Amino acid sequence: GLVPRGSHMELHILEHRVRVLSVARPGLWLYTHPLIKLLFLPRRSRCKFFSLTETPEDYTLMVDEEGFKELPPSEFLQVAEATWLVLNVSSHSGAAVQAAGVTKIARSVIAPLAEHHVSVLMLSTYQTDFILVREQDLSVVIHTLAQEFDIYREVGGEPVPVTRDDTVHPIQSPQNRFCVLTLDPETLPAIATTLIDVLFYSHPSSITFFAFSLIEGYISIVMDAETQKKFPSDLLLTSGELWRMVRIGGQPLGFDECGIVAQIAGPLAAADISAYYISTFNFDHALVPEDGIGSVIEVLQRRQ
Amino acid sequence: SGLVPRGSHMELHILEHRVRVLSVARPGLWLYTHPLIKLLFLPRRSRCKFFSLTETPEDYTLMVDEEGFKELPPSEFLQVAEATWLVLNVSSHSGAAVQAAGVTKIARSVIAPLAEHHVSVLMLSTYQTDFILVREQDLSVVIHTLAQEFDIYREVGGEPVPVTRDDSPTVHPIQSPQNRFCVLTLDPETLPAIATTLIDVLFYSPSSITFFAFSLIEGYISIVMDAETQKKFPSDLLLTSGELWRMVRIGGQPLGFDECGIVAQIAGPLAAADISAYYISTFNFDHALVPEDGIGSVIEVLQRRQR
Numbered sequence: 001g002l003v004p005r006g007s008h009m010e011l012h013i014l015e016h017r018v019r020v021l022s023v024a025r026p027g028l029w030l031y032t033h034p035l036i037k038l039l040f041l042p043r044r045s046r047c048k049f050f051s052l053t054e055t056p057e058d059y060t061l062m063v064d065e066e067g068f069k070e071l072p073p074s075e076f077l078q079v080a081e082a083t084w085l086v087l088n089v090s091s092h093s094g095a096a097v098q099a100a101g102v103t104k105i106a107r108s109v110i111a112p113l114a115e116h117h118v119s120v121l122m123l124s125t126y127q128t129d130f131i132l133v134r135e136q137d138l139s140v141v142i143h144t145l146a147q148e149f150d151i152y153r154e155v156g157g158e159p160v161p162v163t164r165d166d167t168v169h170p171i172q173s174p175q176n177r178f179c180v181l182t183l184d185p186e187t188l189p190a191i192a193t194t195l196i197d198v199l200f201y202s203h204p205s206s207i208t209f210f211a212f213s214l215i216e217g218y219i220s221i222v223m224d225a226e227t228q229k230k231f232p233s234d235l236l237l238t239s240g241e242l243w244r245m246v247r248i249g250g251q252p253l254g255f256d257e258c259g260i261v262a263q264i265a266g267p268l269a270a271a272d273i274s275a276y277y278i279s280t281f282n283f284d285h286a287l288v289p290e291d292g293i294g295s296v297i298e299v300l301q302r303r304q
Numbered sequence: 305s306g307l308v309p310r311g312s313h314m315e316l317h318i319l320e321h322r323v324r325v326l327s328v329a330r331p332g333l334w335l336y337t338h339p340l341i342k343l344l345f346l347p348r349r350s351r352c353k354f355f356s357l358t359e360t361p362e363d364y365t366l367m368v369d370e371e372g373f374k375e376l377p378p379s380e381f382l383q384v385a386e387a388t389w390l391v392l393n394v395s396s397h398s399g400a401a402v403q404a405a406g407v408t409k410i411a412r413s414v415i416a417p418l419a420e421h422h423v424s425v426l427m428l429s430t431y432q433t434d435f436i437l438v439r440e441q442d443l444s445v446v447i448h449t450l451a452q453e454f455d456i457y458r459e460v461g462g463e464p465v466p467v468t469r470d471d472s473p474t475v476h477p478i479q480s481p482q483n484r485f486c487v488l489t490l491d492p493e494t495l496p497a498i499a500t501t502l503i504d505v506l507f508y509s510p511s512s513i514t515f516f517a518f519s520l521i522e523g524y525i526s527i528v529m530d531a532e533t534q535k536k537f538p539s540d541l542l543l544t545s546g547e548l549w550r551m552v553r554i555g556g557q558p559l560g561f562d563e564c565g566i567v568a569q570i571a572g573p574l575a576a577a578d579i580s581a582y583y584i585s586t587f588n589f590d591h592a593l594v595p596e597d598g599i600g601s602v603i604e605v606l607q608r609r610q611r
């Protein structure tokens with residue numbers, strides 16, 4: 001709520017240079033060796049950005065350049081053309097804002113990027129909301145957001161100020177209840193065998209969705225409450241806040257079309273609903289608090 | 305030392321497993337991480353009941369039953385021995401398991417006679433028991449050879465069934481690396497705790513040798529690892545000890561699968577000297593593990609002679 005008059009939030013362009021990939025489910029097995037390394041043995045990779053998400057269609061992978069080098073090319077692997085940069089928002093301090101804050105940046109970030117034809121990919125995590133943009137759009141990004149945000153670019157691990165350089169998609173709601181969880185990285189070994197089983201060895205009203213990310217040492221997991229029961233239940237949160245999913249799109253969305261996240265986040269913000277938002281290679285996914293799910297579906301139906 | 309009835313016979317069990325013997329080149333191991341993780345750690349997901357992986361300087365040798373073999377994609381990196389192998393195990397009269405590290409205790413009764421009849425063997429000693437692999441087509445010669453001293457049973461749907469009248473060259477060089485080896489087991493329910501360090505050791509990268517063995521056969525785990533590799537683990541690897549083992553590597557060039565008498569010319573002299581041994585055959589070479597303090601005596605005994 002209350003803030004000083006002259007004050008501006010901060011937009012951080014992080015160091016990461018990210019490739020976005022799809023691995024066909026039948027080929028996943030081929031990538032077990034490099035993925036296990038990136039998940040469980042980061043003492044052996046220079047990777048600092050790793051996102052893996054299971055959908056019905058594929059496994060989408062978002063990996064920094066160092067992580068990308070570990071992946072052998074194959075006909076099972078589709079690679080998005082562009083290299084992507086990672087945006088994050090924080091308060092004037094450089095202090096993290098609440099998670100599930102995608103709707104809080106609908107008007108200030110998401111709609112203005114779409115208005116300037118800047119395609120985004122979202123990656124909400126337990127800790128924060130990341131927005132990925134292609135390299136090519138960076139100058140338009142700065143143009144778009146310098147008015148309201150103090151923009152900082154990560155150069156040698158430090159935040160540095162920049163100056164000049166530096167249509168309506170169908171929705172589904174499956175019935176799964178989702179948890180958004182974290183875990184101490186020191187606890188990863190104890191969970192490793194059941195995590196490997198879930199990710200690598202697993203065969204309309206329900207959807208298969210499982211998200212695991214390790215970003216700068218921070219672990220984020222989204223899983224089915226049913227899938228949670230497979231683990232010791234020594235995964236962390238503050239709660240049982242369970243979440244319901246809305247999946248966005250009819251056919252595969254590209255990396256070119258703008259305004260998708262804007263259609264979802266704008267109406268949801270106008271209704272004061274929180275959301276995590278996760279983009280995969282083909283589709284978008286919003287996670288809204290379970291008790292507000294009918295109201296979400298209502299609000300989204302109102303867009304023309 | 306014990307006593308038994310004069311007219312009693314130890315039992316020879318031909319187990320249910322049908323085994324394939326494979327070599328994976330070190331540069332291609334990564335391709336096999338998915339099915340091997342499954343066979344090691346998620347045995348519920350496969351019908352495999354016999355799995356053995358040993359790392360050497362040359363390769364990774366895999367011994368697996370037909371059901372595990374199914375899970376392994378062909379590639380340039382994978383060599384398969386032609387034959388299907390059957391698995392023999394000795395027990396006492398009345399079906400009881402025999403002490404481990406007992407290759408020398410069967411040198412005279414099993415090993416020498418099989419070599420005398422040109423039955424080529426592969427040895428797999430584990431923490432639990434000594435397995436002797438023979439090719440399927442030799443089975444009737446095996447029976448002829450061992451029927452005299454042993455009551456022979458074929459395992460059929462997990463039950464031992466008595467067998468009736470056949471029923472359903474060169475002296476090799478030796479080197480002992482300086483490595484000290486332990487033979488370990490694990491409670492299967494504690495594999496998860498160890499999974500990432502074990503994965504890291506297997507899948508992620510002369511006076512000493514690289515040798516590591518892991519087997520999971522009928523729910524039982526067996527591991528052989530270097531004393532220094534042991535330091536990378538939480539120290540609930542179970543043994544009876546500080547009795548470490550020294551390795552004698554046997555052969556000067558790859559030994560293949562046809563030559564008989566190799567295990568015999570090693571286990572024979574050691575039985576005469578009353579020194580105990582584990583014995584493990586890999587795709588290229590044979591390996592005896594002997595008590596560390598007896599190594600000089602072993603080398604002595606072995607240089608005296610004229611798989």
Ligand SMILES: NC(=[NH2+])NCCC[C@H](N)C(=O)O
Pocket residue numbers: 114118119120121122253254255256257258259260261262279280281282283284
């Ligand atoms: N492959 C995708 N997930 N595409 C949709 C992502 C969001 C879209 N680029 C936008 O700017 O609104």
Ligand SMILES: [Mg+2]
Pocket residue numbers: 421449
């Ligand atoms: Mg004879």
